[PDB]
From a paper:
GPR158, a class C orphan GPCR, functions in cognition, stress-induced mood control, and synaptic development. Among class C GPCRs, GPR158 is unique as it lacks a Venus flytrap-fold ligand-binding domain and terminates Gαi/o protein signaling through the RGS7-Gβ5 heterodimer. Here, we report the cryo-EM structures of GPR158 alone and in complex with one or two RGS7-Gβ5 heterodimers. GPR158 dimerizes through Per-Arnt-Sim-fold extracellular and transmembrane (TM) domains connected by an epidermal growth factor-like linker.
Cryo-EM analyses for GPR158 (residues 1–863)–RGS7–Gβ5 complex revealed three types of GPR158 states: apo GPR158 and the GPR158:RGS7:Gβ5 complex in a 2:1:1 ratio at an average resolution of 4.3 Å and in a 2:2:2 ratio at 4.7 Å. Since the 2GPR158–RGS7–Gβ5 and 2GPR158–2RGS7–2Gβ5 complexes exhibit virtually identical structures, except for an additional RGS7–Gβ5 heterodimer in the latter, we focus on describing the overall structure of the 2GPR158-2RGS7-2Gβ5 complex and close-up view of the 2GPR158–RGS7–Gβ5 complex. In both complexes, structures of GPR158 and the four domains of RGS7 DEP (Dishevelled, Egl10, Pleckstrin), DHEX (DEP helical extension), GGL linker, and the RGS domain, and the Gβ5 subunit were clearly visible and their models fitted well into the cryo-EM maps. However, most of the cytoplasmic domain of GPR158 (residues 669 to 863) is disordered except for a coiled-coil (Ha and Hb) comprising 61 residues. Another RGS7–Gβ5 heterodimer binds to the Hb helix, which is visible only in one GPR158 protomer. The second RGS7–Gβ5 dimer is oriented in pseudo-twofold symmetry with respect to the first dimer against the Ha helical axes. Similar to the first dimer, binding of the second RGS7–Gβ5 complex is achieved through helix Xα3′ from the DHEX′ domain. While DHEX′ of the second RGS7 binds to the Hb helix, the RGS′ domain of RGS7′ shifts proximal to the micelles. Thus, although the interaction between the second RGS7 and Hb helix is not as extensive as the interaction of the first RGS7, the RGS7′-micelle interaction contributes to the stability of the second RGS7–Gβ5 in the GPR158–RGS7 complex. The ICL2, ICL3, TM3, and first helix of the cytoplasmic coiled-coil provide a platform for the DHEX domain of one RGS7 and the second helix recruits another RGS7.
Author numbering:
A (entry chain C): 18 to 218, 256 to 450
B (entry chain A): 703 to 763
C (entry chain D): 15 to 353
Amino acid sequence: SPNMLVYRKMEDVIARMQDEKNGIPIRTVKSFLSKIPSVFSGSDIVQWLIKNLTIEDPVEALHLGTLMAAHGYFFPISDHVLTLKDDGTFYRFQTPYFWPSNCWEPENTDYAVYLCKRTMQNKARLELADYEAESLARLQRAFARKWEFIFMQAEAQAKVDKKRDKIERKILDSQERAFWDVHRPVPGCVNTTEVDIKKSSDELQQQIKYWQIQLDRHRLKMSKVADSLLSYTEQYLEYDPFLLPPDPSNPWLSDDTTFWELEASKEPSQQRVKRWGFGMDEALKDPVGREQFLKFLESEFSSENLRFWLAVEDLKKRPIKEVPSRVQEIWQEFLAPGAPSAINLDSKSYDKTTQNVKEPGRYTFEDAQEHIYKLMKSDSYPRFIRSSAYQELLQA
Amino acid sequence: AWSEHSLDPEDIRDELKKLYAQLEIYKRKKMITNNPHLQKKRCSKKGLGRSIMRRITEIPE
Amino acid sequence: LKSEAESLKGKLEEERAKLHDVELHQVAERVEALGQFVMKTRRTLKGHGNKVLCMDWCKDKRRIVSSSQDGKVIVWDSFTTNKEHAVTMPCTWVMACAYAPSGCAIACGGLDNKCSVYPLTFDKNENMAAKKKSVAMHTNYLSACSFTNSDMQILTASGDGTCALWDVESGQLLQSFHGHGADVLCLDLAPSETGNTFVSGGCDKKAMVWDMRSGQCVQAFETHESDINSVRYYPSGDAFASGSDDATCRLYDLRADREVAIYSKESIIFGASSVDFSLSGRLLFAGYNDYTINVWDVLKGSRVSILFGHENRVSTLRVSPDGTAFCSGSWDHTLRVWA
């Protein structure tokens, strides 16, 4: 179960927190009104975080502390809503029987028990806040039968704990107050219990063959990948609109629209034209690049292979209703010998084509597309980038 | 003491004594809680006794 | 035979030593480090009435799609904050939405086992849900979709441990993948239009990548410490990293077949609930469970900011494709547009 590991890590945290030799010291304050022992101030825990965790931002360490304290690992002695506030207020750890890691789950009758007990310990005031008084009103109206032993065991517990010493009753009642704060919190702050429903739950011959495919699994050195990754970063590094953008026009930040609108304009910017020059794949991604490359191929009387590859791609878009209607037709137009558009195949290519053409398939012309595609990538794109039209358009 | 062994056994025995005291008071209330029906009182008493013996045998384990 | 198998493994170790002679960041320290960022809020959305649990950009680079857990899908304009659509799903826990390339339809579903798709346009002013046409349907809750660039074929993933491609009008299944045994949660297209492949990993602590031309589980990896909760391709089409509820994000190559560098920090402890790259392929994004976001350098491995905006947990996160900003999914019942 996932969150179990999370709670385990934070358990590591608090275990290092109340360390014998290091740790925060749980002090005993003396006041003009009273003498309160076994507390400490939130500035202490803030300092402890910053020391032993090296959390550079005070705010960041404070937010870590915030959610920790909203998972019941320490609470403010005079408040319902768990929030760590860096100041002189008094805190306390929680008990190993009342962590939240212990799969606990209170229920409505037990909330009634704690309500009767708190309301009946003191009888000097309605020692409570308006939300908890509201909850008790509902519990009354709906629990008409079962009240009595609730009251019974409540005052029984009151005697069984008051019989022990006066500071004991105080600390135990403080703890077993806060632990019900965290498991039924004030209307505002988020519950920290819930979870998402998603987590709501020959033999050696194939073995040996896996070993052999790992052998023939061609790999390259990490330095090679390093160069590839750095270089693919660099070639658009000057295009990153987060890090260093030359067009400062930011429709988000600087309330402009012109950047995208220039992007909509079919006329390519000089960035655009320099960016075409990296790879014809990116070109074909560009509609503008498709148009200009196709123009050159036409004016050079060489506008077929691109026509084919566009044909393959535009075929790979329609549903299964038209796959046969196109495959036979595209064969008869390009891959049927005797048609004007003469795609050119070798032995195994045309063999594969002839065998598959009976059956229209989502991966029909894979090897032929590879063949013509390596052809175009090897020949066309180079001369295009080398071409006068490319140079004249990249100049301005 | 703000502790783990001590406070662990402390809260544990606290809940334990609370349970056992609740049980004794239940034994007395058998006839004292004459306010409602017998079998209903019977069912409540039975459920309480069962859960209490369960919690006891678990505290013993 | 066992000895020979382990010796081939040792030979893989030897070739890995030769290939990784110097570490990724052991060479990466060479590139000049990076400077200060000042990103903070630039918008806010105030329409939902629950948590929000999915979001996607269009290709028009300005709209917004996001579905909720209470039956109500939305279509904003963060540039304008003015609703132009609305729609209600019959069910609860709508756990995945997707946007059409051109802007024609959106697929929302999960926990009802059937992934409906609605025609996005301003076609019928009566309802955005009334034209509900069942297209896919598994027998379990449905994790996500990737209209895989044709606008007539959508992926889906459920607790079945098996994904497939489902046509638009027909409901006619097109191929299947049954290499798994748990709940898969991840799915993303490749950036390349070379081989329309994709990845699926999941509760099994592993990740595996399908080749849609066959349906055969070619690559497969496992290093995570728990369930995984999303993944994304390195936007050059060459690798992909991720993070999960280990809080320990990692990045993986395709060509070397090896982990590249650890992404973790003891400070953050909570779960990792999304990732997505920046158009440079320089940064790294990830929404977390400790309510922050966390941009990390992809090379030098340091943090660069933590931009505290969300009163609750981060659900899922994306980069706009233009490359100009990013949004967050979060447990605070609203969205922001983080620039």
